[PDB]
Write an enzyme that holds these catalytic residues in place. Structure first.
Site, PDB file in Angstrom:
ATOM      1  N   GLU A 220      -6.386   4.172  -5.814  1.00  0.00           N
ATOM      2  CA  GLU A 220      -7.627   4.464  -5.105  1.00  0.00           C
ATOM      3  C   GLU A 220      -8.011   5.896  -5.473  1.00  0.00           C
ATOM      4  OE1 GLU A 220      -7.493   5.380  -0.960  1.00  0.00           O
ATOM      5  OE2 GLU A 220      -9.533   4.686  -0.594  1.00  0.00           O
TER       6      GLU A 220
ATOM      7  N   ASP B 163       0.848  -1.189   0.000  1.00  0.00           N
ATOM      8  CA  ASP B 163       0.000   0.000   0.000  1.00  0.00           C
ATOM      9  C   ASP B 163       0.888   1.244   0.000  1.00  0.00           C
ATOM     10  OD1 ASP B 163      -2.368   1.727   0.425  1.00  0.00           O
ATOM     11  OD2 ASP B 163      -3.303  -0.040   1.358  1.00  0.00           O
TER      12      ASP B 163
ATOM     13  N   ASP C 162      -2.979   4.778  -2.262  1.00  0.00           N
ATOM     14  CA  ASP C 162      -3.950   5.428  -1.397  1.00  0.00           C
ATOM     15  C   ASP C 162      -4.259   6.839  -1.861  1.00  0.00           C
ATOM     16  OD1 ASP C 162      -5.461   5.305   1.189  1.00  0.00           O
ATOM     17  OD2 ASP C 162      -4.166   7.024   1.665  1.00  0.00           O
TER      18      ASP C 162
ATOM     19  N   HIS D 299     -11.045  -2.496   3.412  1.00  0.00           N
ATOM     20  CA  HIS D 299     -10.927  -2.152   4.832  1.00  0.00           C
ATOM     21  C   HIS D 299     -11.621  -0.821   5.154  1.00  0.00           C
ATOM     22  CE1 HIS D 299      -8.069   0.301   2.828  1.00  0.00           C
ATOM     23  NE2 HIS D 299      -7.883   1.005   3.932  1.00  0.00           N
ATOM     24  N   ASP D 300     -12.152  -0.157   4.126  1.00  0.00           N
ATOM     25  CA  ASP D 300     -12.857   1.122   4.283  1.00  0.00           C
ATOM     26  C   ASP D 300     -14.366   0.971   4.082  1.00  0.00           C
ATOM     27  OD1 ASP D 300     -10.527   2.723   4.700  1.00  0.00           O
ATOM     28  OD2 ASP D 300     -10.244   2.923   2.528  1.00  0.00           O
TER      29      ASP D 300
END
Ligand SMILES: [Ca+2]
Length: 586
Positions: free
Chosen positions: A274, A104, A212, A348-349
């Site tokens: 993302e 990430d 991210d 995870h969000d």
């Protein structure tokens, strides 16, 4: 397929990714936190599921103010997770199992504990002052408090600025107070970011990066006050000035070139951005192979359904068509191009997909979990499965707000308390929403067994970092599901086998067309691959639902579905409750 450049095979197009949240996957030493040795011990499980690659959420040295997305050192593993050598050993073990490994990449911002920020904040004159966004107060209010430079809202609620007492200026932090945004206008800063966050990990053998909020690096000059679009909020979305900014493609092209020139062994590197929100043109600018930016991106429209555009934690009604269209936004734009797409429902969000898009009742949670697997198995793009999704995990129930760990909840709660009052309609709406939408529904420990109280995530005497979902007691756990031939887990194994066996049309299928788009229950579509036609009929309801196959003839054979194989009448044109079917014609 020749007029469809998107059909050109690549490892990362047809790889199924499994996303691991390291705090919550597997604890190997009974401290209540997942760790790298834990992950290593479960790689065989991930391979057996059918995954081709793993993405691990941030495991770098971090105060954990945003659970790893606040990084204090890109080149050091958080000691609680392990050492750098533990990580290198994990990457090697992953590779030796025949799986790819992505990390990430979190470089819109870093922790305020990062040495770069410790230096930047130390004075107004140091070499790293403008590696971040520092601005004087706009003024002081009637109570004597400094006023932030603009009206921008943090992604977690309240102002997107934090005052520094020592240097008497505010610094920008779109996320939490200890996540200062990096200033990509500074070329020295960009170069240091590439060396530390990207180059180090390329040198240590990663196959790619999940990037991210990669769409936030370019801020519009002047950081102007944002439009007042929310009449019941002090702070306003900065999107017009921070999302897909004027230099964003320049920056992504530069980083892509850095990667190309840094790789030492000619290996193919995937990047998944993302990117949050983007027009189809913006998506093409990012993911067209000829652009040399990203391999693919995540777009949030499908995970936004049922939430207000003004505030994620205010629920609004939606119908199936809204979700169909939002899902299709992920992939329709690539048709007849050299772009590529992602396919996912969980991360995870996000809350759990069965709760959101199926029916998590004891009666329907298994069959609707399987229906979602049928849907995802058939869609074009890189498929992602999030830890626990394969078990048919559901949202937790009846938690008080103080039980939530997420900074997103704590900060939003406090902003509402300050602006509207703790006992207010605004708070009531927020509390309603978190029960459905919170990121924390993704973050409870992974459920390996029915063992009390920690479900095999840790030993029975350990205190997990975050509370277990009670669902482990209801058979939602690896041990019970392996043994149950009818389980969601065993179904996901079948779905991935089906997807791989028919990958030309499931992974690389094109000319996607909706059938009966307006239908509130039936989700139906066709896809093509040369002479092949795939037809899906998926019943997102507890009612029976009719369907038609366009240009129906004897060539359409039932190839996958969630009702018992030996009990399905392929010639029938009514779906049972929560039934899905995939037909393929040659
Ligand atoms: Ca541990």
């Amino acid at each position: 397929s020749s007029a469809h450049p998107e059909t050109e095979p690549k490892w990362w197009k047809e790889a199924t990714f499994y996303q691991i949240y390291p705090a919550s996957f597997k604890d190997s030493n009974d401290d209540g936190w997942g760790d790298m040795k834990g992950i290593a011990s479960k790689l065989e499980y991930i391979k057996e599921l059918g995954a081709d690659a793993i993405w691990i959420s941030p495991f770098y040295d971090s105060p954990q103010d945003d659970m790893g997305y606040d990084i204090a050192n890109y080149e050091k593993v958080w000691p609680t997770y392990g050492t750098n050598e533990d990580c290198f050993a994990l990457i090697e073990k992953t590779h030796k199992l025949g799986m790819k490994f992505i990390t990430d990449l979190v470089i819109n911002h870093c922790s305020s504990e990062h040495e770069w920020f410790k230096e930047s904040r130390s004075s107004k004159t140091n070499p790293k002052r403008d590696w971040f966004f520092w601005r004087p107060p706009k003024g002081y209010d009637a109570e004597g408090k400094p006023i932030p430079p603009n009206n921008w809202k943090s992604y977690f609620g309240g102002s997107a600025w934090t005052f520094d007492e020592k240097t008497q200026e505010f610094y920008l932090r779109l996320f939490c107070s200890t996540q200062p945004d990096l200033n990509w206008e500074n070329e020295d800063c960009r170069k240091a970011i590439y060396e530390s966050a990207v180059g180090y990990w390329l040198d240590h053998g990663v196959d790619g990066f999940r990037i991210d909020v990669g769409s936030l690096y370019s801020k519009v000059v002047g950081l102007p006050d944002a439009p007042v679009v929310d009449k019941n909020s002090t702070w306003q979305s900065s999107d017009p000035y921070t999302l897909n900014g004027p230099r964003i493609h320049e920056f992504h092209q530069e980083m892509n070139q850095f990667i190309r020139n840094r790789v030492k062994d000619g290996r193919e590197i995937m990047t998944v951005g993302e990117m949050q929100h983007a027009s189809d043109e913006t998506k093409r600018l990012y993911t067209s192979a000829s652009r040399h930016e990203l391999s693919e991106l995540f777009n949030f429209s499908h995970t936004d359904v049922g939430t207000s555009p003004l505030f994620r934690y205010n629920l609004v009604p939606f119908e199936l068509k809204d979700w169909k269209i939002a899902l299709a936004e992920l992939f329709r734009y690539i048709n007849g191009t050299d772009c590529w797409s992602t396919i996912y429902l969980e991360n995870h969000d996000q809350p759990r997909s069965i709760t959101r898009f199926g029916d998590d009742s004891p009666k329907n949670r298994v069959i609707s979990g399987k229906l979602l697997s049928v849907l995802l198995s058939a869609l074009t793009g890189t498929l992602y499965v999030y830890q626990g999704q394969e078990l048919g995990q559901i949202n937790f129930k009846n938690w008080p707000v103080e039980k939530y760990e997420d900074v997103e909840i704590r900060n939003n709660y406090n902003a509402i308390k300050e602006e509207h009052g703790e006992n207010s309609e605004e708070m009531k709406k927020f509390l309603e929403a978190i029960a459905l939408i919170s990121r924390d529904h993704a973050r409870t420990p992974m459920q390996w067994s029915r063992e009390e109280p920690n479900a095999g995530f840790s030993g029975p005497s350990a205190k997990p970092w975050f509370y277990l979902n009670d669902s482990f007691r209801e058979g939602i756990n690896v041990e019970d599901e392996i043994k149950d031939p009818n389980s969601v887990l065993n179904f996901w194994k079948e779905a991935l086998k089906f997807r791989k066996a028919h990958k030309d049309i499931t992974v690389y299928g094109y000319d996607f067309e909706f059938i009966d788009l307006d239908n509130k229950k039936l989700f139906s579509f066709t896809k093509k691959y040369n002479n092949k036609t795939l037809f899906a009929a998926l019943n997102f309801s507890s009612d029976a639902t009719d369907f038609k196959i366009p240009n129906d003839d004897s060539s359409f054979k039932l190839e996958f579905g969630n009702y018992p194989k030996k009990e399905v009448d392929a010639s029938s044109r009514t779906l049972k409750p929560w039934e899905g079917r995939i037909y393929i014609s040659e």
